[PDB]
Design a protein around this ligand. Structure first.
Ligand SMILES: Cc1cc(/C=C/C#N)cc(C)c1Nc1ccnc(Nc2ccc(C#N)cc2)n1
Lengths: 416, 552
């Protein structure tokens, strides 16, 4: 058991009112589970009803976790999280573990609970106002307020950072070769052991987190070594067509704006003149060399690619068909800090949006592990279609920001 | 021994203070009439007299309805309302008949009394002060302040409703077999049981409100079904929009056609088939609602269908959560789709239409999709669940589309309803180049200043063409050039363009656009057997792009 008798002095930012965010409709079943959940939460004083004198409101919906089919309450504190994260000093997020992204494996623990044993600044509680909607609006919403530290609030991890540091000392001082990070209600633990000897030190981290206080039996396995800026690649054919060359030249033209030394003069010189698309063109001397020299320029790494802790990370995803998706996290155009390709876990999964949504999650999880801050996505979906379904496949206890690209990137296949 | 109605802590907006609005000179009678009202009130406990301290006066007036023998006071709180904080008015959306379970019996209870049992925040009453001028300005004006939610105050409803629900909350909880909608001075209750038990439980209730001293007019709800609410007609098992027929005129102004669109739009909720396109094609950037614009023959043949489908009233049923909830969409035409949501054949809980997002390009499938979505939420909102869709589109079509569309896309559970017109893809571009088909290198270019350009192509078979164009754009030509290659070519053809733009307009497989050009291109595509579009980077001198023929 554990709980602090004091509440850290919290306030919003200057000239910024509270989150008056509209609540979006939820399906009955989600509403039922939210009602039950919010009950025990009241019979444990984590929350308490409020009146009409509270104008503020935050979205709230239900989800399920990775494997378990038990309804969890997720609150979209985005709108607050920005206005609320007025500051954080010497409780500052966390010097980012540049070593976390280097360990063979990494597990993701759920320490969201520990938060619910810490009072909140009385004068602040009015800002965490959320509503359990009513089907059809037949009855008014069931508003509530928070007394304990709100999960998903980007303040809770900061406020609790004090108590947290200690619940770990006996463990950290023990295995100093291990790195532990904390983003939201998530505890990221990575090591350099055997997947089997990895589970070990972790079971020690649960049996330990139990007595010091705290679904605490939930973790994920990552592998930060398998995360790079993938190389761009040109074909290796013995027989080239006008189309093949036309595309090759098209791709090098694009990649030229990322790597300087890319020359195409010689390659297209063998195109000159209205030839048919399906005709075979042989490679010349100049060509063959030019291609080769171009690959060489491409095997190296792009230059001047640096992260800027201040600025925000852009993230693009492109649907490639057959359940394959491609992405690239960056801050400045043509300066990817990372690029990947999400695969097929569920075979002939006839659902693009479920995929997109798992994609966005993994991509975000990675972004937290690398730079300790989620990216801003550019999703290839219609705002309309996305807002109607994502929450039905979401499982993370956090939520990135996102916009919608409604113009087909020519790029789709180059990154193929 | 009454139980008190907990008061609601109310304060003003941050940094702002109260009303110092001057009192306007009245008339002997009014000032005298007010004294009448005002006295009775305080006698009842509503208000009270205040001293020379309280400097918060709010201007009061005095009005009589129309040809009356009674006077009615009117305290203008506009000043205090713009200073009072913000409340959570739980009226962010009224219910929908479609989503209401049938009630065998439904009572009503006037509570225009209880309202006066709900106290105004003690530390706030002072702000609701007003003064009754006295006669002949030979004395101080009588000063009063409220001890109960004012009839025109910002936070009155918000607090009245809250207080009430909190009082009902525990009763509704032990009586799941009833419903209680709190619309104003009326308290509508419904149940589904023997007309005997009903009335009784209504007593079990009237008794409840009595524990807070809340007295009510003996359920002699002067009312009784049918009820007219927010434009509907509710009965024990049916409902419909209040009869608002389509006028008979010859003088349709920007307003007359604007006050016929909302009627059809609102009528669209239940009358199957309401359309408003050609009548929406008569108001775009206008403003002066007086400018009487002509009724095109397009909007005419439309308004004539409206008038006849609006003759035979159509009723919507009630929601029975036991049965399946189904929705059907039909392509009307011109970005027009109309749907019907029902649980049993023809007993539509509600019906509707969808108007294409006025985008330069879009095809039938993208729309069918947008509608499905639009419907989907609206159903979550109303019934808390997704309906099963019946759509005019073969599974096979849909698949080909979502599996090939560049964007992510999805449609909840649905089945193909063969009710023509069917939605379809009109053509598909080859994924690889076609062997043996002529290869058309096309290109176009206009002149920024002279608006003069050329469009044309050159091929492997020596075939050629460059056309001169007046009044055109460096994008237009690029398209015409494809138009040409499509016109002068066989049933199969490989086209090559350096237009990033022009490729995009077709990578979206639009089946209809605003631009007539794009449309003949389409019409052209549709006619072909196999088409392969290929792009190459411009100005890189690439074998084929030796269409220095347009720059000329
Ligand atoms: C939205 C609503 C408006 C009014 C009244 C608004 C006004 N004016 C009255 C009630 C009781 C309700 N709420 C609900 C909730 C569930 N079932 C019902 N059933 C039901 C309601 C009316 C009639 C009738 N006639 C029959 C059955 N009503």
């Amino acid at each position: 058991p554990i709980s602090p008798i004091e509440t850290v002095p919290v306030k919003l930012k200057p000239g910024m009112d509270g989150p008056k965010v509209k609540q979006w409709p939820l399906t009955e079943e989600k509403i039922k589970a939210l009602v039950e959940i919010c009950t025990e939460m009241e019979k444990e004083g984590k929350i308490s009803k409020i009146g009409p004198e509270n104008p503020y409101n935050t979205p709230v919906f239900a989800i399920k976790k990775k494997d378990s089919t038990k309804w969890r309450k997720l609150v979209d504190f985005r709108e607050l999280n920005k206005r609320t994260q007025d500051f954080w000093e010497v409780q500052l997020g966390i010097p980012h573990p540049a070593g976390l992204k280097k360990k063979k494996s990494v597990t993701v623990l759920d320490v969201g609970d520990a938060y619910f044993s810490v009072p909140l600044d009385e004068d602040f509680r009015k800002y965490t106002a959320f509503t359990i909607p009513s089907i059809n609006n037949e009855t008014p919403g069931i508003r509530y307020q928070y007394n304990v530290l709100p999960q998903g609030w980007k303040g809770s991890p900061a406020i609790f950072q004090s108590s947290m540091t200690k619940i770990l000392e006996p463990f950290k001082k023990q295995n100093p070769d291990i790195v532990i990070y904390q983003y939201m209600d998530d505890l990221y633990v990575g090591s350099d052991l055997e997947i089997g000897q990895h589970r070990t030190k972790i079971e020690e981290l649960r049996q330990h987190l139990l007595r010091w206080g705290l679904f605490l039996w939930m973790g994920y396995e990552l592998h930060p070594d398998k995360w790079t800026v993938q190389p761009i690649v040109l074909p290796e054919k013995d027989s080239w067509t006008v189309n093949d060359i036309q595309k090759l030249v098209g791709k090098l033209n694009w990649a030229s704006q990322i790597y300087p030394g890319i020359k195409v003069r010689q390659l297209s010189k063998l195109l000159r003149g209205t030839k048919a698309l399906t005709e075979v063109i042989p490679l010349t001397e100049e060509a063959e060399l030019e291609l080769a020299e171009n690959r060489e320029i491409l095997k190296e790494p792009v230059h001047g690619v640096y992260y800027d802790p201040s600025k925000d990370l852009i993230a693009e995803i492109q649907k490639q068909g057959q359940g394959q998706w491609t992405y690239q996290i960056y801050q400045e155009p043509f300066k990817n800090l990372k690029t990947g390709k999400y695969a097929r876990m569920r075979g002939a999964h006839t659902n693009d949006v479920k995929q997109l949504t798992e994609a966005v999650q993994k991509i975000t999880t990675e972004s937290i592990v690398i730079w300790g801050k989620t990216p801003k996505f550019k999703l290839p979906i219609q705002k309309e279609t996305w807002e109607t379904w994502w929450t039905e496949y979401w499982q993370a206890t956090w939520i990135p920001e996102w916009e919608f690209v409604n113009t087909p990137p020519l790029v789709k296949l180059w990154y193929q | 021994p009454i139980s008190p109605i907990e008061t609601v802590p109310v304060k003003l907006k941050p940094g702002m203070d109260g009303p110092k609005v001057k009192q306007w000179p009245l008339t002997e009678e009014k000032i005298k009439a007010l004294v009448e009202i005002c006295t009775e009130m305080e006698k009842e406990g509503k208000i009270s007299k205040i001293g020379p301290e309280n400097p918060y006066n709010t201007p009061v007036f005095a009005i009589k309805k129309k040809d009356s023998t009674k006077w009615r006071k009117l305290v203008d709180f506009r000043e205090l309302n713009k200073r009072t904080q913000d409340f959570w008015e739980v009226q962010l959306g009224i219910p929908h008949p479609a989503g209401i379970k049938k009630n065998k019996s439904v009572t009503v209870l006037d509570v225009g009394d209880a309202y006066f049992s709900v106290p105004l925040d003690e530390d706030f009453r002072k702000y609701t002060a007003f003064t009754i001028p006295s006669i002949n300005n030979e004395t101080p004006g009588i000063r009063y302040q409220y001890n109960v939610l004012p009839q025109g105050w910002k936070g009155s409803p918000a607090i009245f409703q809250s207080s009430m629900t909190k009082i009902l909350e525990p009763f509704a909880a032990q009586n799941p077999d009833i419903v209680i909608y709190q619309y104003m001075d009326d308290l509508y209750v419904g149940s589904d049981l023997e007309i005997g038990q009903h009335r009784t439980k209504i007593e079990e209730l009237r008794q409840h409100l009595l524990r807070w001293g809340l007295t009510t007019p003996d359920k002699k709800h002067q009312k009784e079904p049918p009820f007219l609410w927010m434009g509907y007609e509710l009965h024990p098992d049916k409902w419909t929009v209040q009869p608002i027929v389509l006028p008979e005129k010859d003088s349709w102004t920007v307003n007359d056609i604007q006050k016929l669109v909302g009627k059809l739009n609102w009528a669209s909720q239940i009358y199957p088939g309401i359309k408003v396109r050609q009548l929406s094609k008569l108001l775009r950037g206008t403003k002066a609602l007086t400018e009487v614009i002509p009724l095109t023959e397009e909007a005419e043949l439309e308004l004539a269908e409206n008038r006849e489908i609006l003759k035979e009233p159509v009723h919507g049923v009630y929601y029975d959560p036991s049965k399946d909830l189904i929705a059907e969409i039909q392509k009307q035409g011109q970005g027009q789709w109309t749907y019907q949501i029902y649980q049993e054949p023809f007993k539509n809980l509600k019906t509707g239409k969808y108007a294409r997002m006025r985008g330069a390009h879009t095809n039938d499938v993208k729309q069918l999709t947008e509608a499905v979505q639009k419907i989907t939420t609206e159903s979550i909102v109303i019934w808390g669940k997704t309906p099963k869709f019946k759509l005019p589109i073969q599974k096979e079509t849909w698949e080909t589309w979502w599996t090939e569309y560049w964007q992510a896309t999805w449609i909840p559970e649905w089945e193909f309803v063969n009710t023509p017109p069917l939605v379809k893809l009109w053509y598909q571009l080859e994924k690889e180049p076609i062997v043996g088909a002529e290869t058309f290198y096309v290109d176009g270019a206009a002149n920024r200043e002279t608006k003069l350009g050329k469009a044309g192509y050159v091929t492997n078979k020596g075939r050629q063409k460059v056309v001169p164009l007046t009044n055109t754009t460096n994008q237009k030509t690029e398209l015409q050039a494809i138009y040409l290659a499509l016109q002068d070519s066989g049933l199969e053809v490989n086209i090559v363009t350096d237009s990033q733009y022009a490729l995009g307009i077709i990578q979206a497989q639009p089946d209809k656009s605003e631009s007539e050009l794009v449309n003949q291109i389409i019409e052209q595509l549709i006619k072909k057997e196999k088409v392969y579009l290929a792009w190459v980077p411009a100005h890189k001198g690439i074998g084929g792009n030796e269409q220095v023929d347009k720059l000329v």
